[PDB]
């Protein structure tokens with residue numbers, strides 16, 4: 001395995017410090033995959049921001065996702081399961097449990113999810129940050145991770161924060177949960 005090139009693609013067991021690190025609000029920035037299904041489906045996502053509340057005693061994360069797709073907001077919450085040893089996270093989408101490797105970069109205000117990382121025919125990365133806009137410093141780290149997987153930068157699908165439809169609903173939820 002080529003290092004430093006692939007340094008950040010390397011899984012490590014998930015600790016409580018790591019769970020704390022990913023706690024809070026995240027914005028989905030960019031992704032790329034060799035999997036063709038994810039290429040056509042992720043292409044429809046205009047924005048997404050979500051909340052992670054990990055439960056360190058249960059190895060779960062409570063997710064509250066706010067996805068913008070088809071000119072509308074789609075809200076869903078669920079309990080993700082954490083597989084500490086394998087450095088992975090899992091959730092149910094469309095009936096089936098799906099797994100993602102939890103990965104990181106130099107900047108702690110960012111994180112990645114790795115999909116099908118064992119399979120060079122299907123692998124991909126999704127890129128997340130604490131703001132909907134990222135710096136060239138932050139981007140560089142993600143683009144490097146794509147270089148590791150030999151995925152062209154041209155294959156990246158990007159969000160556009162101005163197209164978000166979920167902010168007004170998140171606003172409504174804040175009102176409800178703080179009442």
Ligand SMILES: CN(C)CCCN1c2ccccc2Sc2ccc(Cl)cc21
Nearest residue numbers: 028048050089090091098099100113126
């Ligand atoms: C292409 N996308 C369907 C996969 C993205 C990774 N996706 C995910 C997948 C499989 C298992 C766990 C997770 S955690 C997670 C939390 C927030 C968001 Cl927005 C996405 C994910």
